[PDB]
Each structure stands twice: as C-alpha cells, then as structure tokens.
Amino acid sequence: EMEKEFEQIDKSGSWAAIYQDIRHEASDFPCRVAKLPKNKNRNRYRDVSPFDHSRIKLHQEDNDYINASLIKMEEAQRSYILTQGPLPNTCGHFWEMVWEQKSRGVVMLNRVMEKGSLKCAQYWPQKEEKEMIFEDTNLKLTLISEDIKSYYTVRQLELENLTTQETREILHFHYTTWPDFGVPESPASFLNFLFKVRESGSLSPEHGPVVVHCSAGIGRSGTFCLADTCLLLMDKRKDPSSVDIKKVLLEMRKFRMGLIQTADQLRFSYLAVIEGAKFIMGDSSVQDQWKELSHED
Numbered sequence: 001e002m003e004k005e006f007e008q009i010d011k012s013g014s015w016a017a018i019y020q021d022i023r024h025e026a027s028d029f030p031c032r033v034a035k036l037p038k039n040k041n042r043n044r045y046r047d048v049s050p051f052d053h054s055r056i057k058l059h060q061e062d063n064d065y066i067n068a069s070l071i072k073m074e075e076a077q078r079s080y081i082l083t084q085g086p087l088p089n090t091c092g093h094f095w096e097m098v099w100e101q102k103s104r105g106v107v108m109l110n111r112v113m114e115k116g117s118l119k120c121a122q123y124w125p126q127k128e129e130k131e132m133i134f135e136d137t138n139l140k141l142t143l144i145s146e147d148i149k150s151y152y153t154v155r156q157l158e159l160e161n162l163t164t165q166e167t168r169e170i171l172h173f174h175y176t177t178w179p180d181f182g183v184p185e186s187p188a189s190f191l192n193f194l195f196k197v198r199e200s201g202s203l204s205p206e207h208g209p210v211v212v213h214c215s216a217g218i219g220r221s222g223t224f225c226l227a228d229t230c231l232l233l234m235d236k237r238k239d240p241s242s243v244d245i246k247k248v249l250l251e252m253r254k255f256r257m258g259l260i261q262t263a264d265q266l267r268f269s270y271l272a273v274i275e276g277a278k279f280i281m282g283d284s285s286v287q288d289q290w291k292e293l294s295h296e297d
C-alpha cells in the first residue's frame with residue numbers, strides 16, 4: 001500500500017535506491033526511426049527518443065517522424081501523448097499531430113525559457129490579432145482567449161485545417177511554475193492544476209489523447225501522467241490500496257523512456273496520489289482546499 005510504502009521509504013531515506021531500481025527494470029525498445037540521419041533536427045535531445053512501436057506517426061508520405069509517444073494505459077483505459085517541446089522547425093508537425101490525433105487538450109509543464117536556455121519554441125499565438133499559419137502542415141492557429149492565474153494559464157485556441165476549413169477548439173493548460181528537474185510547490189497546487197485539466201473534458205475518451213509536454217517530454221510530463229493514471233485506476237475500482245505506483249510507472253515506461261527524471265519527482269508522485277485519493281473516495285472539501293492553498297489568484 002502506497003501510504004505505508006511511502007513512510008517506509010521516507011523513514012529509511014531510500015528514495016534514490018527506489019528510483020534507481022525503476023531505471024534498472026525499465027523497458028528498452030529500439031528507436032531506429034528517431035535515430036535516422038534525416039530526423040536529427042527533429043529531436044531536441046540526442047538521448048531522448050520515442051520507441052518505434054509507440055511513436056506517433058504524422059499522416060504524410062514525406063517524413064512521418066515526430067518525437068512523441070502514445071502512452072496507452074490499457075487497464076486505466078486512458079491514453080496520453082507525451083512529446084518534446086516543439087522545435088522551431090517542428091511546430092507545424094506538432095499541430096498536425098494534435099489535429100490528426102483529435103486531441104482536445106495540450107498540457108505544457110515548462111516555460112519557454114528556463115535557466116537561461118530555450119526549452120521550447122513559441123508554438124502558439126500570444127495575441128489574438130497575430131494568429132499563426134504553419135505553411136508546411138497547412139494549419140492556422142488563433143488565440144481566442146486566456147485565463148491567467150498566478151502559477152498557470154489556460155488558453156482557448158482555434159485550430160483550423162486550411163485544407164478542409166474544418167475548425168476545432170484546443171484547450172492549452174500552461175503550468176508555469178514547475179521547476180525543470182524539480183517538483184510542483186505542493187501537492188495542492190499540482191492537484192488543483194490537474195483537476196483543471198480534468199474538468200475541462202480534455203481527458204474524456206470521446207476525444208483523442210491529451211498531448212502532454214515539458215522540454216524533453218519525460219520528467220515533468222512523466223510525473224504528471226503517472227499521478228493522473230494512478231488516481232484513475234484507483235477511481236475505477238474505488239480502492240486506493242489496489243494501486244501499485246511503481247508498477248504503473250514501469251507500465252508507462254514500456255511506451256516512452258525515462259518517465260520521471262528524479263527520485264524526488266517520484267516521491268512527489270506518491271504525495272500527489274495519496275492526497276488526490278481523498279477526493280476519489282468522496283471528500284467534497286479538498287478540491288476547494290487545494291484551490292485555496294494553490295494561491296491561483
């Protein structure tokens with residue numbers, strides 16, 4: 001049981017060992033496509049690549065490669081696309097993926113610039129009057145509105161397939177205070193944000209998989225998805241004790257390498273799930289509590 005395991009690991013200060021054990025047992029599959037010479041400039045990080053068996057394929061004959069993985073959690077019955085921060089040359093690809101995969105929401109857990117360095121391209125419009133057109137993929141993106149909070153911003157986008165003139169609304173959830181290689185300031189602020197995504201309907205099975213990205217698409221993104229999946233597994237069974245977090249993380253890692261970068265991100269995952277469990281099991285006050293504690297105003 002996660003709560004007992006957490007206290008046991010915390011008492012013996014062995015999170016480093018626990019995390020390294022996950023790295024040791026983690027799946028290993030080929031990423032031949034990602035490693036092809038022609039795709040070198042489509043990868044932000046040389047060592048972070050999507051496995052061939054679960055990579056997202058762009059629907060185009062020229063080059064279908066993007067650095068993104070489909071994390072399909074069979075038991076939980078929820079899918080996520082984890083991808084890198086789009087590069088200056090892959091923004092059209094990014095939105096082509098969102099369109100073709102029918103995603104309704106995009107979760108960004110990083111800031112464009114972090115520690116002096118540029119972790120992601122500016123792949124959405126910042127002003128209503130200046131919409132973006134991705135000529136290579138023939139798509140138009142317009143900022144419709146945005147709700148700015150103290151540590152996160154929710155953006156309403158309109159994505160147009162210029163070829164068919166079909167239009168779709170995309171919700172952008174920008175987490176703006178999650179330190180790279182770090183953890184959210186508190187379980188409350190993380191949960192408040194996750195529930196924002198959840199309550200938007202973006203995670204519904206009626207839409208395509210939600211797209212989740214930080215910089216490399218594995219550390220912060222992995223932490224976000226592990227917490228959400230665990231709460232879902234717990235929810236479907238209404239039994240917190242039946243969830244093996246480490247086992248869930250390893251399942252996730254069969255679809256994308258490196259999920260969760262640090263031992264503290266893993267530790268935080270337990271914290272978030274344990275706290276979130278209160279809501280799952282029918283506490284109607286914690287949600288408002290988290291909102292208050294998050295200081296979003």
Ligand SMILES: CC1(C)CC(Nc2cccc(-c3sc(C(=O)O)c(OCC(=O)O)c3Br)c2)CC(C)(C)C1
Pocket residue numbers: 023045047048119179180181182214215216217218219220221257258261
């Ligand atoms: C064990 C190991 C060799 C470690 C290796 N680490 C490895 C290799 C290349 C890049 C990264 C990065 S850079 C970065 C950032 O925002 O700058 C990251 O995001 C931080 C965050 O989101 O918290 C991560 Br993650 C990590 C990743 C692979 C999968 C190669 C396995």
